Design a protein around this nucleic acid. Structure first.
Ligand SMILES: Nc1ncnc2c1ncn2[C@@H]1O[C@H](CSCC[C@H](N)C(=O)O)[C@@H](O)[C@H]1O
Ligand SMILES: [K+]
Length: 246
RNA sequence: AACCGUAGGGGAACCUGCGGUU
RNA sequence: AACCGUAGGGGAACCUGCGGUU
């Protein structure tokens, strides 16, 4: 349908080149189950099925856009109508290739959710807002979510997508990012690990001895008078174990 | 210019601490 | 858990100084 409820952040990607570049990056092989957050009118959906899928899952929230199991008449296509920011991905298999052009308003929530379902997603490819994409990369800017993702996934940037390659053109830039899973370190209950990092990135300009005891930081060999945006990934592991109750 | 980087202004997602009624 | 309060964090759209480049 038209009217495209902008409250849902639905901007249809109308560009052949990037649509199939998003699909190719998943490395879809013979018997893979792919999950697509926010299918929409199904521009990416039509491209994913062009690959040798086993099963395409589409998690769409819009009860009018989900009705578009239309011309896309495929036996291996199933459309689930629920919120992908809260949906349990691991209720669809043990190894799932997640993909999706994310709506800006909830994009960060779906990413956080897939990291919760890490055990059943070997790799994910997302189209996100630039200020979210460049943040998750790590090098120029970070956040609590950036480290939360990178702890389990090796984030590798793919491409920038100009606002013109969309129908209702967003005022922000977009980017495709690939989330390849790499076994860094064993963090249990991501619930309290998230709450840990989100307290460290609180007042990120201030020194660290101001949020974690000065000598307790001198323990892990971490400069007490250092900012949050200087710590290696190991540091985040290194100090989380012995400061936060798990 | 747009674009990228950078420095403010601006405040929309989202987050935490404490507290209150439960 | 939930709703409210409260202190901060965070900083998108949009605006500008500066530096590259059409
Ligand atoms: N919470 C949520 N969970 C799942 N899907 C959502 C969602 N919130 C919004 N969406 C849907 O996700 C889509 C993102 S726009 C992506 C559309 C698609 N790439 C295309 O071009 O056809 C929108 O269609 C929107 O309706
Ligand atoms: K503030």
């Amino acid at each position: 349908m038209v009217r495209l409820k902008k409250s849902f952040g639905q901007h249809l990607l109308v560009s052949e080149g990037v649509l199939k570049k998003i699909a190719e990056e998943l490395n879809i092989e013979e018997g893979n189950t792919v999950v697509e957050v926010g299918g929409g009118t199904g521009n990416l959906t039509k491209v994913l099925l062009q690959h040798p899928l086993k099963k395409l899952y589409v998690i769409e929230l819009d009860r009018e856009m989900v009705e578009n199991l239309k011309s896309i008449g495929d036996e291996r296509l199933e459309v689930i109508n629920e919120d992908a920011s809260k949906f349990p991905f691991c209720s669809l298999g043990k190894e799932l290739k997640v993909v999706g052009n994310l709506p800006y308003n909830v994009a960060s929530l779906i990413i956080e959710n897939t990291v919760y379902n890490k055990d059943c997603v070997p790799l994910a490819v997302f189209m996100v807002q630039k200020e979210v994409a460049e943040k998750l990369q790590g090098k120029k800017d970070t956040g609590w979510l950036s480290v939360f993702v990178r702890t389990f996934y090796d984030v590798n940037y793919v491409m920038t997508v100009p606002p013109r390659f969309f129908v209702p053109p967003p005022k922000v830039q977009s980017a495709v990012i690939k989330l390849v899973k790499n076994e860094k370190f064993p963090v249990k209950d991501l619930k309290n690990y998230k709450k840990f990092l989100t307290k460290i990135f609180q007042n990120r300009r201030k020194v660290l001895r101001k949020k974690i005891p000065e000598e307790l930081l001198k323990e892990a060999g971490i400069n007490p008078d250092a900012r949050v945006e200087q710590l290696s990934l190991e540091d985040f592991f290194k100090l989380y174990r012995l400061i936060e109750d798990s």
